[PDB]
Write a protein that binds this ligand. Structure first.
Ligand code: TDZ
Ligand code: ZN
Length: 258
């Protein structure tokens, strides 16, 4: 009986195995656009993905992860609210059963169809496992997806999903360029938070882009054909793999823009 997104093991249950679920800096949150503070001291984000080396795509039973070589400074996030250099290790999505839900963060209580997370770790901690134990260990760049025109840079991801339908399946996934998933603007909100899945560690500086990307209905429909289950288990469609908004508590969301 392990955690997941069902009635019996979903987000409302996670606190029993992971009591920090009720902690002081949990993610995601609702971004109240009118109460976010413009912070003119916030620097532009520096996204350096020109040398990114994708390796593999994995269905881990919760989402699919596109994994990168993080053994060198190849794909790094710097600037914005960050001190030092954060190395890209993986990206994944959260999405809904319907276009009207799927994102983890909300904007004035608006849910997007999906949310992309680009996960980076602070190089001063040496390895991802050490970074997650630190309050400034991770930087996650979150990007909303809305349904409209196709995202050409997403199609290579969509097209490999048939090969990783079930939990524990992986496929080679080299030469994928994550710059093709970015919107035009790097305007962002930022706040201190957590992993949005168990173990829910409070180690993340969240950077959520204001501008969504558009994906086609056909692209997100292919996400919804994935399975939570393993091969030869009863089929459970991988949909609604999002944690709902958690209390903001004693935090202030800062905007990079007016
Ligand atoms: C004891 C121990 C723990 C608890 C440990 C790790 C190691 C090496 C450990 O020895 C590393 C990964 C991990 C198992 C958890 O790391 C994760 C990082 C990110 C995620 C994805 C979350 S965060 C996000 O933006 N959205 C997600 O779904 C899940 C797990 O934590
Ligand atoms: Zn995530």
């Amino acid at each position: 009986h392990h955690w997941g997104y069902g009635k019996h093991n979903g987000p409302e249950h996670w606190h029993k195995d992971f009591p920090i679920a009720k902690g002081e800096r949990q993610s995601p949150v609702d971004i109240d656009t009118h109460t976010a503070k413009y912070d003119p001291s916030l620097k532009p984000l520096s996204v350096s993905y020109d040398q990114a080396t994708s390796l593999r795509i994995l269905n881990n039973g919760h989402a699919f992860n596109v994994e990168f070589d993080d053994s060198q400074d190849k794909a790094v996030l710097k600037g914005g609210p960050l001190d030092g250099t954060y190395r890209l290790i993986q990206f994944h999505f959260h999405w809904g059963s319907l276009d009207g839900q799927g994102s983890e963060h909300t904007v004035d209580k608006k849910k997007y169809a999906a949310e992309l997370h680009l996960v980076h770790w602070n190089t001063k901690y040496g390895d991802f496992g050490k970074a997650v134990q630190q309050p400034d260990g991770l930087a996650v760049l979150g990007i909303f997806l809305k349904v409209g025109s196709a995202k050409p840079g997403l199609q290579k991801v969509v097209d490999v999903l048939d090969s990783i339908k079930t939990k524990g399946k992986s496929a080679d996934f080299t030469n994928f360029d994550p710059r093709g998933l970015l919107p035009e603007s790097l305007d962002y909100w930022t706040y201190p938070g957590s992993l949005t899945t168990p173990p829910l560690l409070e180690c993340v500086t969240w950077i959520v882009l204001k501008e969504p990307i558009s994906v086609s209905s056909e692209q997100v429909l292919k996400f919804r054909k994935l399975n939570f289950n393993g091969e030869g288990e009863p089929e459970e469609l991988m949909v609604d793999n999002w944690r709902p908004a958690q209390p903001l508590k004693n935090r202030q969301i800062k905007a990079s823009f007016k």
